[PDB]
What does this fold into?
Amino acid sequence: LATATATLHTNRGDIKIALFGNHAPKTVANFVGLAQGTKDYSTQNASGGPSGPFYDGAVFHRVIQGFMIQGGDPTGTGRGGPGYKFADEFHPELQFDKPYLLAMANAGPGTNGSQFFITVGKTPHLNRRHTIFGEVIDAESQRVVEAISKTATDGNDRPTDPVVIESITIS
It folds into this structure.
């Protein structure tokens, strides 16, 4: 299925994710573009600057145990994005019937920006509400995602110890 690989190098470990470029071409192209600094975004990146890799220094600001981990907001608040919205991409072969799925966070139809999430369980109520565009490959990466999901959080589901995406390798 996969047409490319992404590794989120976090301060709590690496997460190798297979990207579904043939099922969600625009979403994957958007994620890869931001990751590498190739996409033209109009806000600031997670390092506060105008250009380069968009997600470096980004946190997972929303972690809910046995549900998912969500990040990719340059402000780390949950209200931010790269300065644009774009369409969802639902594919009949992609649904939330396994854990460890990379998908886009959103505020309802057509609101994808930069925020994404990784599930830690089956979440069928998210079917046809969130674009799936990836899946974590190896068992070790699944463990990092698991450990991140179990981290201590405040009353808003924000981790007390910041989980930081230090950079992202594409390959």
